[PDB]
Amino acid sequence: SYERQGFGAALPLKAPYGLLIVDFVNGFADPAQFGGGNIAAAIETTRTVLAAARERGWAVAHSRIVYADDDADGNIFSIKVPGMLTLKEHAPASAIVPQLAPQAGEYVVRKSTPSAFYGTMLAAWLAQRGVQTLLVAGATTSGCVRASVVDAMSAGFRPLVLSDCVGDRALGPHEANLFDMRQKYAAVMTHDEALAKTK
Amino acid sequence: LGSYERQGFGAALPLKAPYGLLIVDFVNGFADPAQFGGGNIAAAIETTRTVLAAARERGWAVAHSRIVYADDDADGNIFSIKVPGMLTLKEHAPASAIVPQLAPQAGEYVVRKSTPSAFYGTMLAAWLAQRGVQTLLVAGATTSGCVRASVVDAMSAGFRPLVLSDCVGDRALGPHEANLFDMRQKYAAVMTHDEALAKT
Amino acid sequence: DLGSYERQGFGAALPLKAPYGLLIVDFVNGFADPAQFGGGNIAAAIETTRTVLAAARERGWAVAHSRIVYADDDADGNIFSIKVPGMLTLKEHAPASAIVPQLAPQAGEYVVRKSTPSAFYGTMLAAWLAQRGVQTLLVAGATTSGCVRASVVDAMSAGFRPLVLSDCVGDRALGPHEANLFDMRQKYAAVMTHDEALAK
Amino acid sequence: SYERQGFGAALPLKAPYGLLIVDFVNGFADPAQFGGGNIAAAIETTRTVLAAARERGWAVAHSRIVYADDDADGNIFSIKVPGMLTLKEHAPASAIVPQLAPQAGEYVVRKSTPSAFYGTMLAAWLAQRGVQTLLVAGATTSGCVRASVVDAMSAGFRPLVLSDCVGDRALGPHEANLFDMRQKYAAVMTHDEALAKT
């Protein structure tokens, strides 16, 4: 059991706060490309958190999956999921969804792996700013979100997973992955609890 | 659940040499259910011995992971706020020692970590790169923890992951199975040890 | 005094080993132009590198180019760009930041963008090279006492044998150029002129 | 050229502060193995800095070069510099010099490459503590110090190179490397200046 071995202990929240919005891009919001399930409701709920973040003067990062136009950086990930390779810089599918369009000062991290931390400058970007707790929204819960939450935690940041701002293709994976995160990696709670508990 | 197929997840990852083996966190603490064991870990340990012995006889690069924190908790992290038992895993605590069944021999790297992935804040990527490893077989514990973290990173780091499905262990079966699904769909070739050894 | 190096066993030979690759670091219009960030022996280094790039292309060698790029709104403005404020003007579409027409990239050659000195720091270079199984990496670019050196020490650290093309790295100032080659020869890389490198 | 192209701009100092001492270990204190030049003097001066940091409550981290007993992690670095191999965990040459012995709470970072950040948890450890400016001491100026300094900057930290607390086996490399760092990568100043200003 998790309870028996001391898992899922609370992870106290601590300022300064920042927000990471992972991979909320056109391709992931379209159920015919990489979207589906509860991903779109998650986008909508993130709108509230993003506006709170901006008002509160928190650091905000967005990630995007972007591969080179010649497929020169086509990788292991793009063998497992071929479609990832079609997320080119200027392709509509790879652009941030219009509901969550980045404002000035917000860092757009481009990646070709699931984590927004891997082979990117995100850790360094957040450390420069002294960020202590990173709120996380995005898609998918059992993909880039999970991987970005493990890395945030490993990079020394306290992850607050916004359970209603993370969306997945399929609810079993979504639930199975929230569970892991609550047990091993993160504070996990709804956006309105997060927003309340963070001022 | 049909969206995985429609959207083109779960494509086959062709195995490619040179091969290497990573054994994640099969330490006495994770073999003993009073501490971090239970579920199907013990069986994953046993089967892993065959993979280890094949690795040695085939001249494969072998690496092993250990969780280790400092004796004064000086590296106490976010990971150990969430799972405070992790902090007991000290360098010379029996609990942090690789299970005897799978003791390393000469040439086999042991990677000490304080996070879930064997790649994070360690030399593993660099160690494999220098050896030209193309496909990394993975065994270890726990499927829904350090095995999955190491597999997503292995892949990210440019290595082809091959999860030995009967050589990775968890303390609970639902998490074990749910994380196998995800890995098979997004990150690894997944097969039993005998398929894996036959095909390398 | 420098006799200590030979006594303590510095500067041993780094045997070369295929597969080979080529990194050209930051040979961009702003480092070529002596009115912006160039000068020294950088113009000469750029041209000599052409022969290496062509030879890399004849031999089918993995090839990677680096560029310093910050966000248009200074979103990713950092510590490096406080110390050297003009790097912050290296934007994606600023001609200063573009690769020099002499060395324009081709299909399959990787353009890594960075906001730090090393082509490896916070980029996917290590994993791009790993995937391709690269053992030895030839390095060219500017500046020798800057991004070149940072990139060479990283390459080494990541598991690759660096081969610093002494006549294909340039600096805006020659004293730093010569000091950093010395360091690199003593500790971090095989160091030779390009005719020598291409002959092996 | 550095002047006309905007190099060497001041790097303002910002709390919280941390201190990293790099590879001040017996092998590097010993002129017969890896020591010499002005290293012995850097170690003694560092005593002053470490005492201050402990008193002021700062995060303090010490790095060490450590390869496996069986050479399993023998690497490219260990090819150019084969003596780095000989620094096993329990070889007295890898141990931190006694004058700078760690206390409880101070992180000992083990590395098999130049930089204290590379393939280590040093960035995460400092990030979790919200360190903004990292004071740096150690050996060798033109080796592991510089490699750590450049990484510290890259990782988001403001590096403060302590010019009388970093040593090398040769004064040329030491001065060249201090020059590079001041121009591109850090605030450089003597421990007297650093301590009063922090």
In whole angstroms, what is the distance from residue C147 CA to residue C32 CA? 14
For this entry, resolution in Å reads 2.4
How many domains in chain D? Answer: 1
Q: Residue C22 carries which DSSP code?
A: E
Helix C149-157 with D146-154: angle, nearest 10 deg: 100
Which of these is catalytic: A20, A53, A123, A144?
A: A144
A128 near C CB under 8 A? yes
Beta carbons of B77 and D128 less than 8 Å apart: yes
Cβ(D153)–Cβ(D25) under 8 Å? Answer: no
In whole angstroms, what is the distance from residue B155 CA to residue B117 CA? 12
Residue indicated by tokens 């050209």: C24
| Upstream peptide bond of A140 is cis (omega within 30 degrees of 0) | yes
Per residue in C5-22, is it b (16+ CB within 10 Å) or e — as a string? beebebeeebeeeebbbb
Alpha-carbon D164 to chain mean position: 12
Decide: residue B56, CB within 10 A, 0-12 exposed, 13-18 middle, 19+ buried.
middle
Count the neighbouring beta carbons within 10 Å of the beta carbon of residue D101: 11
- Nearest-CA residue of chain C relative to B132? C133
| Tokens, residue D140 | 């060798």
Interface size, chain B vs chain D, as Cβ–Cβ contacts under 8 Å: 51
Helix B173-186 with B148-156: angle, nearest 10 deg: 10
Cβ(B15)–Cβ(B135) under 8 Å? Answer: yes
A177 near B CB under 8 A? yes
| Tokens, residue A129 | 């700013």
In whole angstroms, what is the distance from residue D174 CA to residue D140 CA? 8
Q: Residue B133 carries which DSSP code?
A: -
- Nearest-CA residue of chain A relative to B134? A76
| Tokens, residue D180 | 């590079």
- Nearest-CA residue of chain D relative to B109? D72
| Tokens, residue C128 | 């791009």
Beta carbons of D5 and C80 less than 8 Å apart: no
For chain C, the straight-line distance linking the first and the last C-alpha, in angstroms and rounded, comes to: 32
Of A108, A119, A128, the CB nearest to C124: A119
**CATH number reported for the structural domain that contains residue A41 in this entry:** 3.40.50.850
In whole angstroms, what is the distance from residue C151 CA to residue C109 CA? 18
Q: What are the helix (H) ranges across chain C?
A: 4-7, 29-32, 42-59, 80-83, 125-131, 149-157, 174-187, 194-199
User: What Rg, from alpha-carbon coordinates, does chain C have?
Assistant: 16
In whole angstroms, what is the distance from residue B108 CA to residue B24 CA? 13
Q: What type of residue is B104?
A: P
SS3 content of chain D, % helix, strand, coil (to 5): 40, 20, 40
Beta carbons of C79 and A128 less than 8 Å apart: yes
Residue (of A82, A62, A74, A49) closest to A139 by Cα position: A62
Touching subunits for chain B (3+ Cβ pairs under 8 A): A, C, D
Cβ(C106)–Cβ(B105) under 8 Å? Answer: no
How would you list the strands of the sheet with C110-114, edge to edge?
C110-114, C62-68, C20-25, C136-142, C161-170, C190-192
User: What Rg, from alpha-carbon coordinates, does chain A have?
Assistant: 16
Residues 6+ apart with CB under 8 A from B89: B27, B29, B66, B67, B68, B69, B95, B96
Count the neighbouring beta carbons within 10 Å of the beta carbon of residue B106: 9
Residue indicated by tokens 């950088």: C42
A92 near B CB under 8 A? no
In whole angstroms, what is the distance from residue A149 CA to residue D53 CA? 33
In whole angstroms, what is the distance from residue D141 CA to residue C104 CA? 36
- Which of B127, B128, B131 is the mutation pick for testing D, counting most D CBs within 10 A? B127
Decide: residue B100, CB within 10 A, 0-12 exposed, 13-18 middle, 19+ buried.
exposed
Touching subunits for chain A (3+ Cβ pairs under 8 A): B, C, D
Distance from CA of A46 to the nearest CA of C (A): 21
Cβ(A58)–Cβ(A103) under 8 Å? Answer: no
Distance from CA of A126 to the nearest CA of D (A): 8
Cβ(B20)–Cβ(B62) under 8 Å? Answer: yes
Residue indicated by tokens 């963070």: A198
Task: Give DSSP secondary structure letters for B43-72.
Answer: HHHHHHHHHHHHHHHTT-EEEEEEE-B-TT
Residues in chain C within 8 Å Cβ distance of B127: 159
Q: How far is CA C133 from CA B131, B155, B158, B186, C128, in A?
A: 9, 14, 9, 22, 9
Residue (of A156, A165, A168, A174) closest to A19 by Cα position: A165
In whole angstroms, what is the distance from residue D138 CA to residue B40 CA? 48
In whole angstroms, what is the distance from residue D168 CA to residue D55 CA? 28
- Which of A4, A5, A78, A183 is the mutation pick for testing B, counting most B CBs within 10 A? A5
Q: What type of residue is A146?
A: R
In whole angstroms, what is the distance from residue A131 CA to residue A145 CA? 19
Question: What is the span of the domain harbouring residue B8?
Answer: 1-200
Residues 6+ apart with CB under 8 A from C102: C27, C46, C47, C50
Experimental technique: X-ray
Q: What are the helix (H) ranges across chain B?
A: 3-6, 28-31, 41-57, 79-82, 124-130, 148-156, 173-186, 193-198
C130 near D CB under 8 A? no
Distance from CA of A128 to the nearest CA of B (A): 19
In whole angstroms, what is the distance from residue C132 CA to residue C23 CA? 14
Distance from CA of C155 to the nearest CA of D (A): 9
B36 near A CB under 8 A? yes
Cβ(D187)–Cβ(D158) under 8 Å? Answer: yes
Residue (of D27, D86, D95) closest to D63 by Cα position: D95
Residue (of D168, D140, D9) closest to C153 by Cα position: D140
Cβ(A46)–Cβ(A145) under 8 Å? Answer: no
Enumerate residues 107 to 126 of chain B having a beta carbon within 8 A of any beta carbon in chain A.
115-117, 120-121
Q: Residue D121 carries which DSSP code?
A: S
Residues 6+ apart with CB under 8 A from B173: B39, B40
In whole angstroms, what is the distance from residue B73 CA to residue D125 CA? 12
Question: What does the CA dihedral C41, C45, C48, C52 come to, rounded to 10 degrees?
Answer: 160
In whole angstroms, what is the distance from residue B168 CA to residue B170 CA? 7
Residue D189 three-state SS? strand
| Tokens, residue B54 | 């094949």
Residue indicated by tokens 């045997």: C15
- Nearest-CA residue of chain B relative to A175? B178
In whole angstroms, what is the distance from residue C123 CA to residue C31 CA? 21
| Tokens, residue D92 | 């007295």
A78 near C CB under 8 A? no
Residues in chain B within 8 Å Cβ distance of A185: 79, 82, 116
B167 is catalytic: no
Residues 6+ apart with CB under 8 A from B36: A5, B29, B30, B85, B141, B142, B171
